[PDB]
Curated annotation (Swiss-Prot), chain B:
<keyword id="KW-0597">Phosphoprotein</keyword>
<dbReference type="GO" id="GO:0003735">
    <property type="term" value="F:structural constituent of ribosome"/>
</dbReference>
<keyword id="KW-0539">Nucleus</keyword>
<dbReference type="InterPro" id="IPR012340">
    <property type="entry name" value="NA-bd_OB-fold"/>
</dbReference>
<dbReference type="GO" id="GO:0005730">
    <property type="term" value="C:nucleolus"/>
</dbReference>
<dbReference type="InterPro" id="IPR019979">
    <property type="entry name" value="Ribosomal_uS17_CS"/>
</dbReference>
<dbReference type="InterPro" id="IPR000266">
    <property type="entry name" value="Ribosomal_uS17"/>
</dbReference>
From Swiss-Prot, chain C:
<keyword id="KW-0539">Nucleus</keyword>
<dbReference type="InterPro" id="IPR022309">
    <property type="entry name" value="Ribosomal_Se8/biogenesis_NSA2"/>
</dbReference>
<feature type="cross-link" description="Glycyl lysine isopeptide (Lys-Gly) (interchain with G-Cter in SUMO2)">
    <location>
        <position position="169"/>
    </location>
</feature>
<feature type="lipid moiety-binding region" description="N-myristoyl glycine">
    <location>
        <position position="1"/>
    </location>
</feature>
<feature type="modified residue" description="N6-acetyllysine">
    <location>
        <position position="127"/>
    </location>
</feature>
<keyword id="KW-0472">Membrane</keyword>
<feature type="cross-link" description="Glycyl lysine isopeptide (Lys-Gly) (interchain with G-Cter in SUMO2)">
    <location>
        <position position="192"/>
    </location>
</feature>
Swiss-Prot record, chain D:
<feature type="region of interest" description="Disordered">
    <location>
        <begin position="157"/>
        <end position="177"/>
    </location>
</feature>
<feature type="modified residue" description="Phosphoserine">
    <location>
        <position position="88"/>
    </location>
</feature>
<keyword id="KW-0539">Nucleus</keyword>
<keyword id="KW-0007">Acetylation</keyword>
<feature type="modified residue" description="Phosphoserine">
    <location>
        <position position="176"/>
    </location>
</feature>
<dbReference type="GO" id="GO:0005730">
    <property type="term" value="C:nucleolus"/>
</dbReference>
<dbReference type="GO" id="GO:0003735">
    <property type="term" value="F:structural constituent of ribosome"/>
</dbReference>
RNA sequence: UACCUGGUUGAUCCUGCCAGUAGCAUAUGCUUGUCUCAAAGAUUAAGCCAUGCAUGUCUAAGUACGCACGGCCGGUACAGUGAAACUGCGAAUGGCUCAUUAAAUCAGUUAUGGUUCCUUUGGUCGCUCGUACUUGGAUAACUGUGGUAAUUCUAGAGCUAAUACAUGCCGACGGGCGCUGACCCCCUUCGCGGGGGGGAUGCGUGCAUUUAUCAGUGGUGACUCUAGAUAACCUCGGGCCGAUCGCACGCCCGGCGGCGACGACCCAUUCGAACGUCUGCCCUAUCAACUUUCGAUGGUAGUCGCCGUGCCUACCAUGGUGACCACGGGUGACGGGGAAUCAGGGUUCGAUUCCGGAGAGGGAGCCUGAGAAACGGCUACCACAUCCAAGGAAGGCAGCAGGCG
RNA sequence: AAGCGUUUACUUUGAAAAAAUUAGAGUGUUCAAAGCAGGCCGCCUGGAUACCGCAGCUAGGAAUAAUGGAAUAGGACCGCG
């Protein structure tokens, strides 16, 4: 291998797409972009595997040429766009706006939002760099370098932005007692409140996350996204609402719907 | 006295050639709650490979070891006795990975048997990637 | 050419490694610069990552910082006196980093009788007949005489420097790398740093 | 084997070439390949000699002086039209285009004209006014964006001074406890 | 599922192996109706390959004077396809194999605070003070000469275009500011003297880089971090300030505006890459002392490098390792995740669809290209090997099928 | 609420430990192996979970295996010239 990878095996992709072996050897490799490789979602899986709009992958190639799928105000013509956390894939004429939020499991979920919600995002800043003219720069997780910020936003904070101007609107600070959700791992899909932050010298920092039912658990600082102030989220929640109930209780609610309907 | 090497020996940060009418010294704290020794500030020596008065920073791992050899100039050889469990034969094996760490002359009274904590840094030579952080005294033997 | 690889030699014990791959393009080493003094000539080389480096073969430009007043000029370079690296480079006229060389003083002289207008060196018996710099020393107003009197009391020069200016030649160190960027910048020797190498030139010469 | 320029030999040598030099077409981009070429000197070990007549003779050869080959392609850049037809900056270039008659059996007689490159066009003038408009718009956008940040900076520097004024008020209370 | 029987004796009980016992992979022999999946040249030959094929690609957004087509409304250049050609990106992806390799690859935690980064995304892209209503001249295609036995061989004459190649500005742009600062104004002192303002002329005044200092907007666990200014540097084998193109189309009395593509100076994103730490590897004493001016172990100072380093160079010290098995040798050893048998403890296998490393017969060297020491890319030699008109040209199936051994 | 502890071996918890493969919830491809469905007049849902060896980080304990504090006293503690 005298260069970077360009192809992608179907099985070599990690678990969180639930890709299937019987279809093809290869898989659509996400291109270069603002999001991860194992934490993103190409648009071809978003439409073919999840939404059941198409049957083959060549139909997705036609759709992006028909000026239908717009992403946060910019129409992307690349069907293998790596789209990670909180990107609005917005249908133009039917009006169904979708927001990429993790499900209660490690997967994504189909989630319909109103157009009033789709006008803005919450974004999480990663670092502060002083620009070449003494200009403070905020870099998001999807690398939205927005200059001239409110400096009260700190390293581990979040910013609320508008999309038709590319500027921030408001922010939520990292205070002890805020909401939380684990963005990645075995506890992916755990919506809870922050009960205690602990700083450990040299190594990674850990923050204890407390569930609304009393299930307190620890999460490392790089694996945290805060969703709201106190107990009031600034985003919407899918079904399940990020609880991760035990596997014995899943079957008890599975047979409740079957026997009620028949 | 000092500066017996080939070029001029000074700290790259300091500057004493400005117009006059003691030499200034630059140092740095190391982090992870380790103090800065007194003679690295008080002394007049220089060393570019010291994590206190040189262009090197400790990052990654911090481990420890015990000194066994000092017959080099400005570095020592340490011993690291570690135990490994064998799953098949349920007993332990005595293994060591002895390697050289750069001892700056900021510490003066360094003897045999002293436990010395050591910190990972950038490679400064072929096999050394460590520097002496602080030196603890041996078990007794004050004399 | 030469290869920059750690695995081509022995271990720390004395055993010889067995390489698993051929020398790569990221194991690249090109022949040395070994620059001389003459007309300006920069050769370019393509490096890893699509960037460029500038190799000097004959160079005369050099911007050298006078430490006590922090002013530098692009002054001509003429010769090599001592190098801390090799004694062959002492005799063979080459400039690499940390080279102690002899330079002319005149670009720093012109600034001294212009901003401060004080005689330094300037052995008696010879006067500047074009009268260009006596204008730079005379024709003073009322409130600039106060300023030039302030500069007179704040220009106490070191005794070691004036002897060096009397012969017109100064000592300079090569801080920058002419092999990489094509520039041979540095700073002028001053004070104790200059005093160390005047003992060193006699230690080798005898 | 074709001959070469400057090789200064007389027999048969094999020489590597590169892009930008004649007698070798680069198939791959920048590929080096040796090629059997002949010397720049001419001798009796030749088959075809290529000659260029610079000075015309007194007598008339019926091969080249008699038949004059017409031009195949005329100038296409409008500046070479200005060089050939002695045109200024103000006069039109479109009327001074070099067209060609086109006729064949079975079709009507036609004429074709070249697409003139680098001609003064209000399309590129729309492009020229656009790229200087983005220079205007980016100048105005960052000026007001810095203006709203400066008021935002002026928004904290009064509360932060008052925060320390309340903190310097706090040290005075502990000094009188 | 934590299991056995026969064999030494005239006839017993033990040790003990053998024989039987059952799966796990490979082949062979006989036989075979259906039907759902299906391994499949590696073992010896990482041996050699006849034959054919695997990376080419045009949108409205780079060039169209090929009627090869084609609109007739022409004289205001190109209606629109459009062969071929110039120009960008990819061809460093992928498939095959495990020859090589025993702290080396590889596997788990880590750091680049010690560097790059094609394409994509978020931003600066009138910040610099000194013919622009668009500069210059060269070429492929085409016309024509062919040379040769032979090729993806090549030239002479006529051209023509650039988002190929060089040069370079209108607008910003009138002034903000530091110095040289002539000179002017005011107060006090008998006066020299002291103090406070205004300011002519020019230079400098973007980003990025190089040398040097002063003070210390915003962070890290710690900077020689970022940033501000001072004094200069800006490689002619140069760094940007759109000398590009395409589609609807508008506002004033020639001047103002839109949607883009493309490539760009730089900072962040992504895929990474490489350097680093700790821990983990089969057998061997019929390998006990090994290594070291032919860097082996550290320091000083340099060169190269994407940077840190004996990676390399001159001088200092002769050290560094080993009985806690070093060095050396062999390995039918690429490693791991894992597979089989199993009460448990393990044993054996693991080249084989996933990951990381290596390679295309062998090493050695290399252009272009961000990315190769590439090999369906080159330059030599060695072994092999094709055509030949005897002058020369031309090749790498341990790829897809397929052929020989 | 922020920081410090004479060091380890031990024990317990927590993130991480790349998919398929190990066990395993669901499902009539007619059982079945495999596979990720299907049923109702657009919806309901899933594609879990368990293991992840060794070394390393982290947080409670010092019973057990060691180590020694000070004994020619330059031994601790509050302090002064």
């Amino acid at each position: 291998a005298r260069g970077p990878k360009k192809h992608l095996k179907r099985v070599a992709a990690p678990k969180h797409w639930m890709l299937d072996k019987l279809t093809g050897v290869f898989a659509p490799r996400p291109s270069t972009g603002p999001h991860k490789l194992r934490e993103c979602l190409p648009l071809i899986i978003f439409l073919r595997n999840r939404l059941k709009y198409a049957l083959t992958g060549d139909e997705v190639k036609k759709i992006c040429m028909q000026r239908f799928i717009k992403i946060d105000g910019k129409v992307r013509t690349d069907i293998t766009y790596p789209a990670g956390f909180m990107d609005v894939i917005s249908i133009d004429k039917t009006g169904e706006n979708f927001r990429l939020i993790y499900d209660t499991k490690g997967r994504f979920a189909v989630h319909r939002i109103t157009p009033e919600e789709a006008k803005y995002k919450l974004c999480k800043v990663r670092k502060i760099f002083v620009g070449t003219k003494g200009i403070p720069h905020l870099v998001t997780h999807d690398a939205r370098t927005i200059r001239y910020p409110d400096p009260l936003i700190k390293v581990n904070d979040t910013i609320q932005i508008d999309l038709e101007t590319g500027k921030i609107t408001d922010f939520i600070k990292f205070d002890t007692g805020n909401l939380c959700m684990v963005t990645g791992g075995a506890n992916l899909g755990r919506i809870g409140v922050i009960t205690n932050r602990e700083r450990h010298p040299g190594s990674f920092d850990v923050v204890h996350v407390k569930d609304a039912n009393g299930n307190s658990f620890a999460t490392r600082l790089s694996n945290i996204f805060v969703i709201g102030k106190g107990n009031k989220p600034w985003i919407s929640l899918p079904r399940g609402k990020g609880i991760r109930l035990t596997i014995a209780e899943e079957r008890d609610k599975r047979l409740a719907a079957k026997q009620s309907s028949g | 006295d000092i500066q017996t090497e080939r070029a001029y020996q000074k700290q790259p940060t300091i500057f004493q050639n400005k117009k006059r009418v003691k030499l200034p010294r630059y140092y740095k704290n190391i982090g992870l709650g380790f103090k800065t020794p007194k003679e690295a500030i008080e002394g007049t020596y220089i060393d570019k490979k010291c994590p206190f008065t040189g262009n090197v920073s400790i990052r990654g791992r911090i481990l420890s070891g015990v000194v066994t050899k000092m017959k080099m100039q400005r570095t020592i050889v340490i011993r690291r006795d570690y135990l490994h469990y064998i799953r098949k034969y349920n007993r332990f094996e005595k293994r060591h990975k002895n390697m050289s760490v750069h001892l700056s002359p900021c510490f003066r009274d360094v003897q045999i048997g002293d436990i010395v904590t050591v910190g990972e840094c950038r490679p400064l030579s072929k096999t050394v990637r460590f520097n002496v952080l602080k030196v603890t005294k041996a078990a007794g033997t004050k004399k | 050419g030469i290869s920059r690889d750690n695995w081509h030699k022995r271990r720390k014990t004395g055993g010889k490694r067995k390489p698993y791959h051929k020398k790569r393009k990221y194991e690249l080493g090109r022949p040395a610069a070994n620059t001389k003094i003459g007309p300006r000539r920069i050769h370019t080389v393509r490096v890893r990552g699509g960037n460029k480096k500038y190799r000097a073969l004959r160079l005369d430009v050099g911007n050298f910082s006078w430490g006590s007043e922090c002013c530098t000029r692009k002054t001509r370079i003429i010769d090599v006196v001592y190098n801390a690296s090799n004694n062959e480079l002492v005799r063979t006229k080459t400039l690499v980093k940390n080279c102690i060389v002899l330079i002319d003083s005149t670009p720093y002289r012109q600034w001294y009788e212009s901003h401060y207008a004080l005689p330094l060196g300037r052995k008696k018996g010879a006067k500047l007949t074009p009268e260009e710099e006596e204008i730079l020393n005379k024709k003073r107003s009322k409130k600039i005489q106060k300023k030039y009197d302030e500069r007179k009391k704040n220009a106490k020069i070191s005794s070691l420097l004036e002897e060096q200016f009397q012969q017109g030649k100064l000592l300079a160190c090569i801080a920058s790398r002419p092999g990489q960027c094509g520039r041979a910048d540095g700073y002028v020797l001053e004070g104790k740093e200059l005093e160390f190498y005047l003992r060193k030139i006699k230690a080798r010469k005898g | 084997f074709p001959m070469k320029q400057g090789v200064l030999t007389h027999g048969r040598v094999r020489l590597l070439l590169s892009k930008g030099h004649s007698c070798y077409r680069p198939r791959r981009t920048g590929e080096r390949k040796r090629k059997s070429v002949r010397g720049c000197i001419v001798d009796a070990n030749l088959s075809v000699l290529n000659l260029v007549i610079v000075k015309k003779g007194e007598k008339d050869i019926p091969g080249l002086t008699d038949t004059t080959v017409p031009r195949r392609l005329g100038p296409k850049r409008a500046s070479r039209i200005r060089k050939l037809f002695n045109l200024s900056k103000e006069d039109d270039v479109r009327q001074y285009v070099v067209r060609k008659p086109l006729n064949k059996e079975g079709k009507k007689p036609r004429t074709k004209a070249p697409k003139i490159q680098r001609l003064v066009t209000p399309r590129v003038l729309q492009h020229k006014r656009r790229r200087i408009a983005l220079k205007k718009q980016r100048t105005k956008k960052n000026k007001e964006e810095a203006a709203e940040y400066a008021k935002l900076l002026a928004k904290r520097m009064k509360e932060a001074k008052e925060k320390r004024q309340e903190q310097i008020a706090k040290r005075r209370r502990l000094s009188s406890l």
